Amino acid sequence: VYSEKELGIPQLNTVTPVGVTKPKGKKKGKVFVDDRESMNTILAMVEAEKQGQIESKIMRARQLEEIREARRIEAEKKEAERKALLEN
């Protein structure tokens, strides 16, 4: 058993998009996360994974919904940052 990271295994296009890939052995630019909104999105996923299985259908929906609102706020915040930087 050996890690796929250790082997130089090409990345494959699937239902999950590969996106823009980065060359190996080069500067993969650090994308810092420091906003409260960006931290909230990551935190919601972590909490959802730890909680795991919930028997209630409504309680399961609410856990998914709070991640959706966290994503929406982060996207709105980053959009406003782009507009301010582009305009001013």
Partner: protein
């Protein structure tokens, strides 16, 4: 089978009153929900707490009594022995109601209608409802000497 049929009709009426928000019936409905929640399926028990939270959030958007009525019901739901033993399994956390009761204490002081007034939920005085919530948080029937000291303070 007949119990299931009656439970279907009894609970359907309870929820349709909650959706339409009849002011003179919500106290009676919440007593029924607290009385008969342990007779229904487990997965619906967590839904009842979530439905209570939406009612409180709607009133957060008279109004003081309705939010206190739901908070009394939520604690009375968990004070049952069956629901208490299923706390961990069914993910029944009352942290939302404890926090909401905490942020409302300052506003309730300024309210002048606190005194304009065998039941456990349907009580005519908002001050009485406040005392029932406070007794649940600070003097629970179960685990009375394991309560977090910070919450008490």
């Amino acid at each position: 089978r007949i119990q299931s049929e009656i439970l279907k009709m009894v609970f359907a009426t309870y929820f349709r009153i909650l959706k339409a928000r009849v002011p003179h019936l919500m106290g009676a409905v919440l007593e029924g929900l607290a009385k008969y929640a342990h007779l229904i399926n487990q997965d619906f028990f967590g839904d009842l707490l979530e439905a209570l939270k939406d009612l409180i959030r709607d009133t957060d958007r008279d109004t003081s009594r309705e939010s206190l009525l739901c908070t009394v019901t939520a604690f009375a739901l968990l004070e049952g022995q069956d629901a208490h033993n299923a706390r961990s399994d069914l993910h029944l956390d009352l942290s939302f109601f404890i926090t909401n009761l905490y942020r409302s204490l300052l506003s309730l002081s300024l309210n002048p209608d606190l005194e304009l007034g065998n039941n456990k939920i349907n009580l005519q005085t908002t001050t009485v409802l406040l005392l029932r919530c406070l007794t649940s948080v600070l003097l629970p029937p179960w685990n009375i000497r394991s309560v977090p000291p910070i919450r008490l303070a």
